[PDB]
């Protein structure tokens, strides 16, 4: 059980963060209400995206303050767990190359 996407690698000293409305990776197999979740720093730090209510912090509600967790959402998302998406079995599915919409702020080091 894995993230659906490849990682964001942190080459600098700043934690990952995004402006409100930014940071959810593109996934055309998902719908506008689905576009909400968290990045988790693993364990150069690698940060992996998980849809809300899935993955290692599936129990956290949106906005929970935890070191190594940041929250992201896109306009149109619904704040409901994405049990229908869940996580990725790497034996069954390749990781989606993490892709952000054009114009997204990325902090230095990413």
């Amino acid at each position: 059980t894995a993230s659906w996407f490849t990682a964001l690698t942190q080459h600098g000293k700043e934690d990952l963060k995004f402006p409100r409305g930014q940071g959810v990776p593109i996934n055309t197999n998902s719908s506008p209400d689905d576009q909400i979740g968290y990045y988790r720093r693993a364990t150069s730090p690698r940060w992996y995206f998980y849809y809300l209510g899935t993955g290692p912090e599936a129990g956290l509600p949106y906005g929970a303050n935890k070191d190594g967790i940041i929250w992201v959402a896109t306009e149109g998302a619904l704040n409901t767990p994405k049990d229908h998406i869940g996580t990725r079995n790497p034996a069954n599915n390749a990781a989606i190359v993490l892709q952000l919409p054009q114009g997204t702020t990325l902090p230095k080091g990413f």
Epitope: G21, P32, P61, A77, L78, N79, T80, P81
Partner: antibody, heavy 122, light 108 residues
Framework: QVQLQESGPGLVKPSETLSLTCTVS????????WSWIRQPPGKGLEWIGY???????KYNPSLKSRVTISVDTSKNQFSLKLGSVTAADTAVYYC????????????????WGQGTLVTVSS | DIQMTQSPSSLSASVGDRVTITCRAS??????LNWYQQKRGKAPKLLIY???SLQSGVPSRFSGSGSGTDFTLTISSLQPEDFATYYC?????????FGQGTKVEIKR
Amino acid sequence: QVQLQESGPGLVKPSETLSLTCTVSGGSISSYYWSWIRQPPGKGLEWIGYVYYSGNTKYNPSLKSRVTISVDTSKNQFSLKLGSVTAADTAVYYCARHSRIEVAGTLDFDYWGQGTLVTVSS
Amino acid sequence: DIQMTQSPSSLSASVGDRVTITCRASQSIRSYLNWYQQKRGKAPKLLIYAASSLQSGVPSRFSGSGSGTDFTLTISSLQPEDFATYYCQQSYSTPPTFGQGTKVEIKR
């Protein structure tokens, strides 16, 4: 403060289509989710469906086969059509706004209309 | 769908008493749970969201508690204007579903 207003109360004949409109004032339709919710007399609340300002909808599976919800941003309105009604559809019909958390909508209904009583009767 | 079960169906309590009403879900919904107040002839009014967050403008005698399947709404000091039917509602997944309500009256 945001205000929601359903169209006026009255009759719908059995097997015909119920049509209601919700007009939003003091606020904008854009960026929020909006729902229709109903309450038969003496009973509890049943969610009918939601619409997002750009047009996508989602319906209660119990009603999906005979309901449409539409939205008209230029009129700051959204509307319900419920077909093939029977006495089981007699209810107060509410329009309601979903709250937001950051840019996400919730399933939390933070503003409601007054309610309009629709009686299904010949 | 997720079934919400409220208890009791009705209760009476004196002004200044604590009132606690229960809502239980058929599956775990963590803290995705809202409470509404409904007066006769009026729309429901959101009191509590996310199981325990007080909606802005709602008096601080209202609280919510629980996470998972077992939730309560507490009025810590009942006031004469607090008669109403109170409803819970899971906000975890569509379709959002409501309990059948608890009617609160003021004992005098």
